[PDB]
Structure 1
Amino acid sequence: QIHDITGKDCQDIANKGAKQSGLYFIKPLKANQQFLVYCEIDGSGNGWTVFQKRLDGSVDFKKNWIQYKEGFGHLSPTGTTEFWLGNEKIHLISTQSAIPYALRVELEDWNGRTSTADYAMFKVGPEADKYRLTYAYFAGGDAGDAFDGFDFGDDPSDKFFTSHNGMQFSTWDNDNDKFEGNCAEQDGSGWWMNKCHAGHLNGVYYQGGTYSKASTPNGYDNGIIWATWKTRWYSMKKTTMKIIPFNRL
């Protein structure tokens, strides 16, 4: 169920001998109390700390500010459950000791194809700054750089409106986006919204992937999307968001 070795993150845990993916206790520099996390440990001693997982539509991602801050969903020793670790925990891990962390977004198709997109020097700010997302540069990956924004063709400033670097976090009850309306409320989720999005992994789980403007009454593109890999009308089968110290790349 839960393993004995502990550390500051899953890489530290892997550096101490553990070789099995599963549940572990970690305690980041500023964390006053230890908490449970799911570590993904591969054959090369890489230990990834997973903070978000989607795979079957068992959890509703339309949660409020406090829920996204504290975390929701279920942690499993088998890694077959959906959850959001919690913004406060993501903040404590990503900013401890100025250690440079890399974020890996892993996506899976309804056709079996998996893709990734890596971001160097990933960080999540404190609550005072509404858990802002910042990264140095896109490090590569076949899923493409959706965080850089995308020109959908709706408005000439589309790219400026869809980038995510520097965006604060938003939930329906705590709007901090760059939109006149409420992106989080219209979509029904919690995310780093701009004048909405180009990459949005906390959207509605549409079975089969393909959906349309007709699926929803207002026709919102509120699925689990990553514009640089698939159309805004295609919802992902599985997603994984995980972090590891930059030097492990």
Structure 2
Amino acid sequence: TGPRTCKDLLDRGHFLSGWHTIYLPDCRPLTVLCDMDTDGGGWTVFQRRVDGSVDFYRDWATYKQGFGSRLGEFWLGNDNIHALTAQGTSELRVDLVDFEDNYQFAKYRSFKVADEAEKYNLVLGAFVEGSAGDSLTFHNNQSFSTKDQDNDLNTGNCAVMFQGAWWYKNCHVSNLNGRYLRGTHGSFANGINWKSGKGYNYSYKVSEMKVRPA
């Protein structure tokens, strides 16, 4: 009866990026950011970093419900991301911009996060292409971890050691919910980092993670 994705909104003539209401599988309305420009348009954005205004070093409950601002930076929420990716096949695009306004990206053929009981386990399909290189396949089939809920494969606490929240193993090659450290940083791997892109010592200006039906 109503649009189920950003792709449906684009097909109905909504050509400007912006926040729109879609209807989840259980018919629950959810207001989401549609990217109607990048790579054909019709992407639903679930993470956005742009200026460091929002604290991403948050706990399990906050990541679960979503946080931030429609005017800037946000994480849409693990329950919503699960609901968006649970049924069907959604492709993942990651877009990264450095402080000299160079763009890189990574695209994966499928992406989903499982539900809370499986700790928002990441299920990721094949790397398809991207100038940022592949720094997410390494995290496939890992639980999500936050500072207060360590589900990683390190004897210590990765979320604390890298000041983020992610599908940490031992520990990471990407850390996009890390600190907004602004370009090159001496501190090791605690910024908005993508190892195969700018490496463990460069924190991007912009990060966006988004999905679209395959």
Give the TM bin, normalised by the shorter chain: over 0.9
Query: In structure 1, what is the equivalent of residue 79 of structure 2?
Result: 88
**Structure 1 residue 30: deviation in Å?**
2.8
Identity percentage of aligned residues = 43
Partner SS for 1:121? strand
Q: Counterparts of 1:40 and 1:6 in 2: how far apart (Å)?
A: 18
Partner Cα separation in structure 2 for residue 38 and residue 231 of structure 1: 28
1:210 to 2:197 alignment: no
Letter of the 2:11 partner, please give it: N
SS in 2 for 1:25: strand
- Superposed CA deviations along residues 113-141 of structure 1, whole A, max 9, x for unmatched, are 10110011111101010001111210111
Cα distance change on mapping 1:63 and 1:234 into 2, 3 Å: same
1:8 maps to 4
RMSD: 1.7
1:120 to 109, 113, 126: 109
Q: Structure 2 CA distance, aligned partners of 1:205 and 1:188? A: 10
Q: CA deviation at 1:6?
A: 4.6
Distance in 2 of aligned mates of 1:45 and 1:26? 19
Q: CA deviation at 1:13?
A: 1.6
Flag the 1:182–1:25 CA change in 2: closer, same or farther, 3 A.
same
Q: TM-score, normalised by structure 1?
A: 0.82
Bigger Rg, structure 1 or 2: 1
4+ aligned runs moved over 6 Å, structure 1: none
Residue 146 of structure 1 aligns with an amino acid whose one-letter code is S
Q: Distance in 1 between matches of 2:195 and 2:130?
A: 14
> Residues 130-167 of structure 1, C-alpha deviation per residue, up to 9 Å, x if partnerless?
0011112101111000123xxxxxxxxxxxxxx20111
8 Å Cα contact 1:178/1:194 also seen in 2? yes
Counting matched residue pairs gives 214
Distance 1:43 1:68, change over 3 A: closer
Using the size of structure 2 for normalisation, the TM-score is: 0.95
Report the AA paired with residue 190 of structure 2.
Answer: N
- Asked if structure 1 preserves the Cα contact closer than 8 Å seen for 2:24 and 2:30, the reply is no
What is the aligned partner in structure 2 of residue 160 from structure 1?
Answer: none
Quote the Cα distance in structure 2 between the aligned partners of 1:43 and 1:233.
27
- Alignment check: 8 A CA contact 1:40 1:49 kept: yes
SS class of match (2:9) = helix
Shift of 1:244: 0.8
When you count strand as a share of all residues, which structure comes out higher?
2
For 1:243 and 1:52, how far apart are their aligned partners in 2? 10
Give the Cα separation in 1 of the matches to 2:32 and 2:47. Answer: 11
Pair 1:28 & 2:24 matched = yes
Task: After superposition, give the CA deviation of every residue in 1:149-200 in whole Å (9 maximum; x if it has no partner).
Answer: xxxxxxxxxxxxxx20111100011111111111012222211101110011
Contact 1:226 1:232 in 2 (8 A): yes
1:6–1:24: 8 Å Cα contact kept in structure 2? Answer: no
Whether 1:192 and 2:167 are equivalent positions in the alignment is: yes
Match of residue 178, structure 1, among 148, 153, 160: 153
Please, which runs of 5 or more residues in structure 1 have no aligned partner? 149-162, 214-219
Aligned to 1:145: 134
| Corresponding residue number in structure 1 for 2:66 | 71
